[PDB]
């Protein structure tokens, strides 16, 4: 298992514009296009991102390229955030993947906000981090995905994904 496989499972793959759990236009493997409620706006963003006139449909290769870029960016955002970086550096490989998953999903500003869970994670108090993590809108809104990530932090293994 790895970060790409992990996200592909949490996000799925859709080759045609769709609305994510929040009602926003997305495409591919969770690539958010826009928060605007307008499909044209979404399409326009999609075109700009792909580099061609898409008509709201992309290919698999295209979806995968957006994904790599997105994973790369989530990694780079973590490394550049004063709050996330030292946590990530302190973690083992599996757990770093769990962190990248969260950032991919919520953006780094959103994750940097879990002051308490981040401190617990850095101190290696897995169960305390897990309980805190669960007290969040994130967990209440997308509970199955949240539980998968929280378990990964708690255990340090890929069990929730096998």
**Burial per residue of 29-68, b for 16 or more beta-carbon CB atoms within 10 angstroms, e otherwise:** bbbbbbeeeeeeebbebbeebbeeebebebeeebbbbbbe
144 binds Cl ion (CB under 5 A): yes
Find the binder of Cl ion among 43, 63, 91, 145 (CB under 5 A): 145
Is 70 part of the annotated catalytic residue set? no
Residue with Cβ nearer Cl ion (81 or 142): 142
Whether 160 and 151 have beta carbons less than 8 Å apart is answered as yes
Whether 77 and 106 have beta carbons less than 8 Å apart is answered as no
Stretch that binds Cl ion, among 8-16, 110-118, 125-133, 143-151 (CB under 5 A): 143-151
Q: How far is the CB of 89 from Cl ion (least distance, A)?
A: 27
Residue 44 CA, chain-centre distance (Å), reads: 23
Find the binder of Cl ion among 44, 136, 142, 155 (CB under 5 A): 142
33 labelled binding-site residue: no
Q: How far is the CB of 136 from Cl ion (least distance, A)?
A: 13
Helices (H), the chain: 3-11, 39-50, 60-80, 85-90, 93-112, 115-122, 126-134, 137-141, 143-155
What CA–CA distance (Å, rounded) separates 34 from 134? 27
Is 11 part of the annotated catalytic residue set? yes
Q: How far is the CB of 142 from Cl ion (least distance, A)?
A: 4
53 binds Cl ion (CB under 5 A): no
49 binds Cl ion (CB under 5 A): yes
Binding residues: 32, 104, 132
Known binding residues for substrate: 32, 104, 132
Question: For binding to Cl ion (CB under 5 A), which residues are involved?
Answer: 49, 142, 144-145
């Amino acid at each position: 298992m790895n970060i790409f496989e992990m996200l592909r499972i949490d996000e799925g793959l859709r080759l045609k514009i769709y609305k994510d759990t929040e009602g926003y236009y997305t495409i591919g493997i969770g690539h958010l296009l826009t928060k605007s409620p307008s499909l044209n706006a979404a399409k326009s963003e999609l075109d700009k991102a792909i580099g061609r006139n898409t008509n709201g449909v992309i290919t698999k290769d295209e979806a995968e390229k957006l994904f790599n870029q997105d994973v790369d960016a989530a990694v780079r955002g973590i490394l550049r955030n004063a709050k996330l970086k030292p946590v990530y550096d302190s973690l083992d490989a599996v757990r770093r993947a769990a962190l990248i998953n969260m950032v991919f999903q919520m953006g780094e500003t959103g994750v940097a906000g879990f002051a308490a869970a981040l401190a617990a994670l850095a101190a290696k108090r897995w169960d305390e981090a897990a309980v805190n993590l669960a007290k969040s809108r994130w967990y209440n809104q997308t509970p199955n995905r949240a539980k998968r990530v929280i378990t990964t932090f708690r255990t340090g293994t890929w069990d929730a994904y096998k």
